[PDB]
């Protein structure tokens, strides 16, 4: 029994609209990150802790924009994984550490902001502590993402082939998790879920609620703190709503056990939208942090 599949997962106009949308997203991320980085690096008067945090965030964003988008784009253009084992491993590790770096940097920015605002009496954060915390963040991300980059394997499908309009058959490959024990593939992904999404979001949300409580008791200033609260809550909601669907669908795959047609319908059309939203968050974060900072506009 041999199964034959089409080369492209969608038709011409679907590919057209995805390609133009993703090209627009790429150019937007490029221009925004170049502007923010040039502004930050050119001026020596902006040597503070928050500024170097923002520089780290921008560097992470440009890495994501230059790496994550094209590989997934071609992956959604071709039914297979048209790379070897080496690049599958390295790209997996790179995008994993990039996502973890973004999330952890947001958490650290939040905690420094809370320390500055709620309790300004204590000493300001030094540069050495900033370096130690950024190093710890990057190192812990790499350590927690390495095992997935080590275990995964690439395998050939003997009983499956793909036929194009030219009537030629290519071998089909796909890299996945061939873990020796099939049971704990789920436990690993739940560890990743409890490392990136649950605890960071919980801590940010409760502590920003604390900040809003602190400045809640405090005609001009009314609009002032109204806009302050508006922007804080909008940033938090943006992160949460952007990152919910991917994790929801992943856990649904890992435990939900959808039927064959449900599995097909989630595996053709929902995932490109989820990945687009995930990348949109990262490509739009510099716009939020630059257009809403008056000093950087100069």
């Amino acid at each position: 029994n041999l199964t034959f599949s089409s080369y492209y997962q969608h038709t011409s106009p679907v590919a057209a609209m995805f390609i133009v949308a993703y090209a627009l997203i790429f150019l937007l991320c490029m221009v925004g990150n170049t502007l923010v980085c040039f502004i930050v690096l050119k001026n020596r008067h902006m040597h503070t802790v928050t500024n170097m945090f923002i520089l780290n965030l921008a560097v992470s964003d440009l890495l994501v924009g230059i790496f994550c988008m094209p590989t997934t784009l071609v992956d959604n253009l071709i039914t297979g994984w048209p790379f070897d084992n080496a690049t599958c491993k390295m790209s997996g590790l790179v995008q994993g550490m990039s996502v973890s770096a973004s999330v952890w940097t947001l958490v650290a920015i939040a905690v420094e902001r809370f320390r500055c605002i709620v309790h300004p009496f204590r000493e300001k954060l030094t540069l050495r502590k900033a370096l130690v915390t950024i190093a710890v963040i990057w190192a812990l991300a790499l350590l927690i993402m390495c095992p997935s980059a080590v275990t995964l394997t690439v395998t050939r499908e003997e009983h499956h082939f793909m036929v194009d309009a030219r009537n030629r058959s290519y071998p089909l490959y796909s890299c996945w998790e061939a873990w020796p024990e099939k049971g704990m593939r789920r436990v690993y992904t739940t560890v990743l879920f409890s490392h990136i999404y649950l605890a960071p979001l919980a801590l940010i949300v409760v502590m920003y609620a604390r900040i809003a409580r602190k400045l809640c008791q405090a005609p001009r200033a009314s609009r002032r703190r109204a806009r302050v609260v508006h922007m804080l809550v909008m940033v938090a909601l943006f992160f949460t709503l952007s990152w919910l669907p991917l994790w929801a669908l992943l856990l649904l795959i890992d435990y939900g056990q959808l039927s064959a047609p449900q599995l097909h319908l989630v595996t053709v059309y929902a995932f490109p939208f989820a990945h687009w939203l995930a990348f949109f968050n990262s490509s739009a974060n510099p716009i939020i942090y630059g257009y809403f900072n008056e000093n950087f506009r100069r």
């Binding site: 992956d75 790209s91 994993g96 996945w176």
Partner: peptide, 8 residues
């Protein structure tokens, strides 16, 4: 066909 991409 078992398309499931790298989960990030």
């Amino acid at each position: 066909f078992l398309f499931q991409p790298q989960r990030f």
